[PDB]
Amino acid sequence: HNCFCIQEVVSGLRQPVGALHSGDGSQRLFILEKEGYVKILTPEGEIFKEPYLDIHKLVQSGIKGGDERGLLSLAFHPNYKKNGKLYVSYTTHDHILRVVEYTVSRKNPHQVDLRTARVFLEVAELHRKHLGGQLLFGPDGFLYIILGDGMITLDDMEEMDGLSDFTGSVLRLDVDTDMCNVPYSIPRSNPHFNSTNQPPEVFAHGLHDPGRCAVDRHNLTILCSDSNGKNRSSARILQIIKGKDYESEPSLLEFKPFSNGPLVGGFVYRGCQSERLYGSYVFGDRNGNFLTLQQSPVTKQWQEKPLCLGTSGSCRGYFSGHILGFGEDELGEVYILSSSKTHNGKLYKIVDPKRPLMPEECRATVQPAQTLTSECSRLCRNGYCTPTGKCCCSPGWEGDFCRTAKCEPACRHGGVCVRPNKCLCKKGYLGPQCEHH
């Protein structure tokens, strides 16, 4: 038979939202928990006692199920290995969907220091469904953020005033700035770049209730399942070509290739363990029914095909509970994260039993995560530090890395400008500037 196979990796998680890797060589798998935690799974298979990220007090999460409100998504900078930069989305008139950047401990590669929270976006939301929140870097290194309805209606926007124009849209930002005013630059080739009509951040609109959108990096394609609420579920696809400058939005083309009902989301499998699954879009429903969306090269049309699970040895045709999201290895291998109704979150790995667990092609040396050595990370005294390496000085500091203090009128008589507007005077000189004797 041609079935796939699931294998329990980790258990005792608390409501897993999903998992991904950091692209830094350590085959570390970072697991997201809804309450506002990110935990680390070593390639050697240990869940580190200390959480990688613990923001559970900041995040307002669900008090039940169906309540969509926790930590939403995580994304590492394309150059995390050098600049150690994360990007995180989470909930906090009802609530605000925040998108924030964090930077790892300069002393611990396995922990983020929370003092580096640098808010990028704050999206007001009225309801607790159709939130979205998925974050991804396409090639060219732009931050794509995918936002659902928030169940905001047309009339709810003529009533409300101070309310985000982003909900229901794919947003695109250039995070790599040497500027120190705006936390992000609006990209190069965005539609509404200069803008007056429609907000510059919006790259496309039309999303309602999107699942985990499959992301094909090939020059970039994102394929979403969309529940559409009461209406039948569809699939929306967004395509991006070679550095093209847009002045009209790319169309987020809708088509309805699904039959079974709602889907958690999907992925484009590009791991090593499965030969046959290579390049396939795989979508999965809540109860672990799996699909493949294959596009005909000849007709360019789409076709859903089922995908069975089957037990062979301890690698089994079933998992416990229901699927909450999906996972991706550094090696590109693929996971499901499940939970069952307290503290029963599980990580399972999808396996092709026709192939070995460790084929020749799949061997890879793990390069263990390393403390930051980037110039801005070490020298940039205080004030923040942009993913490009620029050090942005907090009021009253100057210098490439802000190490010099600013004293408005200078310190006199050999006095030293220790802090902004603080003079350290030599014995015998009183006064804020050491002016008197």
UniProtKB/Swiss-Prot annotation:
For the region Interaction with SHH zinc binding site, give the residue spans: 154-166
Q: What is the effect of changing D165A?
A: Abolishes SHH binding
Q: Which domain of life is it from?
A: Eukaryota
The gene coding this protein: HHIP
The name this protein goes by in its record: Hedgehog-interacting protein
Please state the protein's primary subcellular location.
membrane
Which residues does the record list as glycosylated?
Answer: N194, N219, N231
Q: Which residues form the EGF-like domain?
A: 375-402, 403-435
